[PDB]
Automatic annotation (TrEMBL), chain A:
GO terms under biological process: carboxylic acid biosynthetic process; carboxylic acid metabolic process
Residues involved in pyridoxal 5'-phosphate binding: 76, 236-237, 273
Modified residues (N6-(pyridoxal phosphate)lysine (covalent)): 178
Source superkingdom: Eukaryota
InterPro entries: Aminotrans_IV, Aminotransferase-like, BCAT-like_C, BCAT-like_N, Class-IV_PLP-Dep_Aminotrnsfr
Family to which this protein belongs: Belongs to the class-IV pyridoxal-phosphate-dependent aminotransferase family.
Keywords carried by this UniProt record: Aminotransferase, Transferase
Keyword 4Fe-4S: no
Keyword Transferase applies: yes
Molecular-function annotations in GO: transaminase activity
Pfam families in the cross-refs: Aminotran_4
Name recorded for this polypeptide: Branched-chain amino acid aminotransferase, putative
EC number: 2.6.1.-
């Protein structure tokens, strides 16, 4: 649907949420079998998710009371756990039920839902593999988080190609495993600050684009969509962009994307669960094309938000 | 001598193991309170967890003496500056608290960890001025060994990793000591899979870097070699350089090709959590004659001697 329809609905739902006297309207967490306010939630100091960031995670959205692509996200964090040699510690059916219960209890209709699986209390260094499967899980539901605020999506945002940092390469850490080892991405955020921009686009140092601080990067040139095929998370928002492109008969190329190409793009946008489809209209301080949000970006934008109401991709939470 | 130094540790350990003090198992300092490390808790929303947005350092106490504490605290300050963190206590205060914790525990041989995190406000969408309410956690445990003492007589088994390479400096500055161990942890598993213990990571560009919590040192034709870049500037490594200089042994901090590991006369690792740790098997083959070598032994001896030298150590008052 259109930006104005999507956002006006969000604003109405928010304003209602903000008037709520339910303390869980600010979020809810599940830690050691108990529901607690996120500010009160605590984890063991000795959890290896803290002591060596030895964890994977995933993030799902709820929009207008509808979970979006929950099955796809759960499959992804099962794959991440397998790649990490972590045993996912709950039945999938159990996690699905608990997450829906959390969202319902909060009353939050537009939510950010985070699932974290850590190595647990026994570190890898000095352990037998069979002693490394008592793994911990933490669940968190918050009001929907925007990597680009609604008001900013109308006009687009300001990016830089980073020059003080490059993406951690796959031979150091497999970027298809969604992880919280953000040392490169965090530095990119600071570089953007220092350079008067907001969004860092990290290279691989070998002249190609990868991803940013919590989003994939998409270029549009001569009617074709391009996005990096390696060095990045296989985003489910990106997956959804591919679906919308198919529905619209727009060619999309998953391939190596040289940095040079960003400087001649007709359109650029970022994509992620925490915000959706986020246009970029300034790059390294200069306009991207004419400086306007472009027509293919808008088609993708509208189709992406329509998927949030499509029963093939979403289901409603029962708030009771 | 591996006899004198270890035998003392074993006696001190045996005494500690019979202690009735609850803190003989360790002690932590969290939000101004002393608690057992198993009971210690951190906020879920701390960015040290939520984005591993932190630095840390580790200091030892050996035989009741802090080793090179001031060097470690200087390093932590440098790591905080590089990370844009504001170290949240006076150095005098942290020194006093750490000594108080060690004394309260009764532990004579200790692993002491200091962690500084970004705190509760994440970097994205934040003004820099709002990112300086940074958190600190302190932890004292019984001394941890990356190579157990009895194993140091024999040496350990290393591999040059082939499924992982070290995070490059352009992705994260390895001179900032950090807990983003994704490469190092995978190296530990690779070593497991290959029937070894210690992973030596490359840079992918044919040179050695460091391993999973230690620096790498080669010895060839009487000269010591260790990587200059891509690694933490270890304080154990610093101490190796001091001992080499005291013994008139040539030590070169330079790029060290992987190839050279396959021809070394001796190899050892170095770290606070274990000291000087010989490697006598590499990729399943003996290093030289498969014996702990003479230069390694001289470095080991000198390293432990420094723990009693007032220039490098001071005694904790256990009251
Ligand atoms: C990656 C790495 N290498 C080496 C070391 C050893 O440094 P130190 O001698 O200061 O314990 C540490 C700590 C570390 O994190
Ligand atoms: C989560 C994330 C993305 C986007 O993933 P989605 O599956 O679209 O939410 C992109 N890059 C990085 C580094 C991420 O952590
Ligand atoms: Cl998930
Ligand atoms: Cl620190
Ligand atoms: Cl320190
Ligand atoms: K997982
Ligand atoms: K698994
Ligand atoms: K620090
Ligand atoms: K600082
Ligand atoms: Na991520
Ligand atoms: Na480290």
């Amino acid at each position: 649907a259109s930006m104005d329809k999507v956002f006006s609905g969000y604003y109405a739902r928010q304003k209602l949420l903000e008037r709520s006297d339910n303390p869980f309207s600010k979020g809810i967490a599940y830690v050691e079998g108990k529901l607690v306010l996120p500010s009160d939630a605590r984890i063991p100091l000795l959890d290896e998710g803290f002591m060596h960031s030895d964890l994977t995670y995933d993030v799902i959205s709820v929009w207008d009371g509808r979970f979006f692509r929950l099955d796809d996200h759960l499959q992804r964090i099962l794959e991440s756990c397998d790649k990490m040699r972590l045993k996912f510690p709950l039945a999938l059916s159990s996690v699905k039920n608990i997450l829906a219960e959390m969202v319902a209890k909060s009353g939050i209709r537009d939510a950010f839902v985070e699932v974290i699986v850590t190595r647990g209390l026994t570190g890898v260094r000095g352990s037998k593999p069979e002693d490394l499967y008592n793994n911990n899980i933490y669940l968190l539901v918050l009001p929907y988080i925007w990597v680009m605020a609604p008001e900013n999506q109308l006009h687009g945002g300001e990016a830089i190609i980073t020059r003080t940092v490059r993406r951690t390469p796959p031979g150091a850490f497999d970027p298809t495993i969604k992880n919280l080892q953000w040392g490169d991405l965090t530095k990119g955020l600071f570089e953007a600050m220092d350079r008067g921009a907001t969004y860092p686009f990290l290279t691989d140092g070998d002249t190609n684009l990868t991803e940013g601080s919590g989003f994939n990067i998409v270029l549009v040139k001569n009617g074709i969509i391009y996005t990096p095929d390696r060095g990045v998370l296989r985003g489910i928002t990106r997956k959804s962009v591919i679906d919308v492109a198919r529905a619209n008969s727009i060619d999309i190329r998953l391939e190596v994307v040289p940095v040079e190409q960003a400087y001649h793009s007709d359109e650029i946008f970022m994509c992620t669960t925490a915000g959706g489809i986020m246009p970029i209209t300034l790059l390294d301080g200069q306009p991207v094309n004419d400086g306007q949000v472009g027509p293919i970006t808008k088609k993708i934008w509208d189709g992406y938000w329509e998927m949030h109401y499509n029963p093939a991709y979403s289901f409603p939470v029962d708030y009771g």
